[PDB]
Amino acid sequence: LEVALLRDDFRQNPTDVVVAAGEPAILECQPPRGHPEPTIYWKKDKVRIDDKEERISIRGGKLMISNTRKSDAGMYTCVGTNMVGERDSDPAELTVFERPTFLRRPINQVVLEEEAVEFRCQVQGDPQPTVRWKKDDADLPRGRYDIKDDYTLRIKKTMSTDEGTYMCIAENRVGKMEASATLTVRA
Ligand code: NA
């Protein structure tokens, strides 16, 4: 003699998850109290899903998504079920971002004193990565460098002190990536 019952308040709602593509995502749910003890299943944008695919696993209170792809993003809902009815959790957004990569890596230059040189860096990612430039792991000297819109690093009248390793850094909220290239000067 226990009450046939289903509450409306989840013991644990799933919470939003932010991931870089390739990383795993884990959503957690505990259903409301009830009798009989509710089970759970999961919906993605109101459509019920299953653990058919190898990279998806549903067990306990967890939905586990290995090797996230941009497709995986959406609103995930946990549903608590028993013979009284179904209850929908507050939804959790899965965001899948893309760690920055290089469309165009900068390439070693070799140049004779007093004469133009340019270095190129084109990046991709989601969000769009912030591009930074360095020299010998320190800030670009003043006066010298001309800057196009695209992250092209330009010089009109090169000189010997300009010698060293020039690094392009691409950075968003989900990763960082470095690519450097030598500038060689000759009298
Ligand atoms: Na599976």
From Swiss-Prot:
Q: Which domain of life is it from?
A: Eukaryota
Ig-like C2-type domain: residues covered: 8-95, 100-184
Q: Which cysteines are joined by disulfide bonds?
A: C29-C78, C121-C168
- Main function: Receptor for SLIT2, and probably SLIT1, which are thought to act as molecular guidance cue in cellular migration, including axonal navigation at the ventral midline of the neural tube and projection of axons to different regions during neuronal development.
Q: Which disease is it linked to?
A: Vesicoureteral reflux 2: A disease belonging to the group of congenital anomalies of the kidney and urinary tract. It is characterized by the reflux of urine from the bladder into the ureters and sometimes into the kidneys, and is a risk factor for urinary tract infections. Primary disease results from a developmental defect of the ureterovesical junction. In combination with intrarenal reflux, the resulting inflammatory reaction may result in renal injury or scarring, also called reflux nephropathy. A chromosomal aberration involving ROBO2 is a cause of multiple congenital abnormalities, including severe bilateral VUR with ureterovesical junction defects. Translocation t(Y;3)(p11;p12) with PCDH11Y. This translocation disrupts ROBO2 and produces dominant-negative ROBO2 proteins that abrogate SLIT-ROBO signaling in vitro.
Subunit details: Interacts with SLIT2.
Protein's UniProt name: Roundabout homolog 2
Q: Which gene encodes it?
A: ROBO2
